[PDB]
């Protein structure tokens, strides 16, 4: 129900033993490079 | 504000991954119990034939044994079993 | 999502525990299934010597 | 101010994936672990199968 | 550590992927491999008696080594992904809580208010304050010089910055050192242009090094090797 | 491989054995017997985990039911 309790919980699940493992204006222009990739995704999938 | 509804979406797709590893360990777990069911079963078997086999050996006389040379080759050959996957 | 990674963590922890002490049970008892076959098979070559001699 | 908020949230997020991970890593290790371990246990159930048939077949007449 | 070794995979990789297209494009013949037979498809040519043995083995080598090296650097996921964004994070906050306020304090000092409103944006778009708010008693905003000092502390937290942010900070930050941009590189001195760059050119690979999964996969991709729909 | 795996450990068996004074003397004489090199199959032989489009594959049980037939095919040849 904490965030202590569950990264306890990770720690708790790894100590076990294992063995055996192997032997501004910048905003057009953001628009604009987020169209070309939007292309540029679909030209790929072609 | 933008970055709390980002924020809510992140953690959206926390849980959704949450539940995918949920399912990543459930298939694995899943076929480690009916491989080792399988296993159990094998074992369980082998039991029952270890103890009829040994009631069966302790019950054996030397003089009761007959050895008849007309046999020894009329006899059916005994062969392992050469399965190969 | 603080919450359900802990359910998680825990189960997948109890289970992992419970598949590691059924592989353990299971090869001790193949270990002591070993050890009486064996003697089986002792028994049966020391009745065949018998009978040779 | 919203950016140091939106800071601590990018914390808590990375803090929760990178549990995810591993738990997943352990998951993995846990699977390569148990298979090489049930891989060993066939074999040697295995070989009890065929023994304890051999003894069977050289003990017994027809 | 991490850059060194993403890098030196994808040499590997791009060298194995030249040579093998290399050896596509320049199918041999019997005339210069006398155990090709006269009878041969384009493929035959091309890849099965285009290679020799020392060649071969060359190969597996590089591709056994490229494949162990990818799965060392996946044993260190973690902290790898620590160190990589704990180091970009301070080196952003260093910079942009640091280096800025000189040019800053200069372009005030001298009216420059259009290098002024991109270092302001620059400033406030990832700069994170401890104290919840900016400083009110930095003199690099008045514009006198300081004094003798005015220790500021900077956080430390393992967190990268988001890719509109990199992105919007990479692109402001590179129109103050555009020479074509009334040039606004004339209006500042030598020393801040010169850590402006090098921050610029170092800040290339934080995207890259941020997805390190990601990255890490696309250097070691070997799926080229099978295909074979144009044949 | 277990055909391999077994040409080369029967014929390093069959070296270990031979005498090493006929060998000296054969050696002597011009009719040197070459030895058989040296090999890792050992790496191999411990492999139980080769992965492959998501099955995993226990090459040490066929590489041990491949030598089992060859060991019972040499003793019924020999017979």
């Known amino acids: 129900v904490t965030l202590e309790d569950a990264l306890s919980n990770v720690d708790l699940l790894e100590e076990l033993p294992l063995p055996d493992q192997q032997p501004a204006r910048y905003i057009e222009q953001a628009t604009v490079h987020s169209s070309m990739n939007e292309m540029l995704e679909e030209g790929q999938e072609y | ?30 076929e480690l119990f009916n491989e080792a069911h399988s296993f159990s079963f094998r074992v369980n078997s082998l039991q029952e034939r270890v103890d009829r086999l040994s009631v069966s050996v302790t019950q054996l006389d030397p003089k009761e044994e007959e050895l008849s040379l007309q046999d020894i080759t009329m006899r059916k050959a005994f062969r392992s079993s050469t399965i190969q996957d | 999502t603080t919450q359900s990674l802990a359910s998680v963590a825990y189960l997948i922890n109890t289970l992992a525990n419970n598949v590691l002490q059924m592989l353990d049970i299971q090869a001790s008892q193949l270990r002591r299934m070993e050890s009486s076959i064996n003697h089986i098979s002792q028994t049966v070559d020391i009745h065949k010597e018998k009978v040779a001699r | 101010r919203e950016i140091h908020q939106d800071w601590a949230n990018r914390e808590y997020i990375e803090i929760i994936t990178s549990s995810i ?41 027809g | 550590l991490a850059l060194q070794g993403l890098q030196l995979l994808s040499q590997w990789s791009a060298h194995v992927m030249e040579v093998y297209s ?22 035959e040519r091309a890849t099965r008696y285009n290679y020799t043995s020392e060649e071969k083995f060359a190969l ?65 778009t990832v700069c994170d304050w401890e104290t919840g708010h900016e400083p009110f008693n930095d003199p690099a905003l008045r514009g006198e010089k300081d004094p003798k000092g005015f220790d500021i502390k900077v956080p430390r937290r393992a967190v990268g910055p988001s890719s509109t942010q990199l992105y919007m900070v990479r692109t402001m930050l590179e129109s103050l050192i555009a020479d ?48 074979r729909e144009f044949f | 491989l277990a055909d391999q795996i077994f040409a080369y450990y029967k014929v390093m068996a069959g070296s270990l054995l031979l005498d090493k004074r006929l060998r000296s003397e054969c050696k002597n004489q011009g009719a040197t ?47």
């Open chain 2, 1 to 30: 504000n933008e970055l709390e509804c980002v924020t809510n979406i992140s953690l959206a797709n926390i849980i959704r991954q949450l539940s995918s590893l949920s399912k990543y360990a459930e298939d694995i777990f899943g």
């Open chain 4, 21 to 61: 991970k591993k738990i997943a890593d352990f998951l993995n290790s846990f699977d390569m672990s148990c298979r090489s371990r049930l891989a060993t246990l066939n074999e040697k159930l295995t070989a009890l199968e065929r023994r304890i048939e051999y003894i069977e077949a050289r003990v017994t007449k």
């Open chain 5, 22 to 43: 290399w050896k596509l494009v320049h199918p041999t013949d019997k005339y210069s491999n006398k155990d090709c037979p006269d009878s041969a498809e384009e493929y």
């Open chain 5, 60 to 124: 597996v080598e590089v591709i056994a080594m490229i494949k162990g090296l990818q799965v060392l650097m996946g044993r260190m996921e973690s902290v790898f992904n620590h160190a990589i964004r704990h180091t970009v994070y301070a080196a952003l906050q260093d910079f942009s809580q640091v280096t800025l306020r000189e040019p800053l304090r200069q372009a005030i000092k001298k009216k420059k208010n259009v290098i002024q409103s991109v270092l302001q944006a620059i400033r406030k």
């Open chain 5, 180 to 227: 074509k941009s009334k040039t606004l590189r004339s209006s500042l001195e030598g020393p801040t242009i010169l850590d402006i760059e090098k921050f610029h050119r170092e800040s290339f690979f934080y995207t890259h090094l941020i997805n390190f999964s990601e990255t890490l996969q696309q250097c070691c991709d070997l799926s080229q090797l099978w295909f």
């Open chain 6, 33 to 79: 017997i070459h030895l058989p090199p040296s090999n890792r199959y050992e790496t191999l032989l411990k492999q139980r985990h080769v992965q492959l489009l998501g099955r995993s594959i226990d090459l040490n049980r066929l590489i041990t039911q491949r030598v089992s037939a060859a060991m019972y095919k040499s003793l019924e040849l020999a017979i």
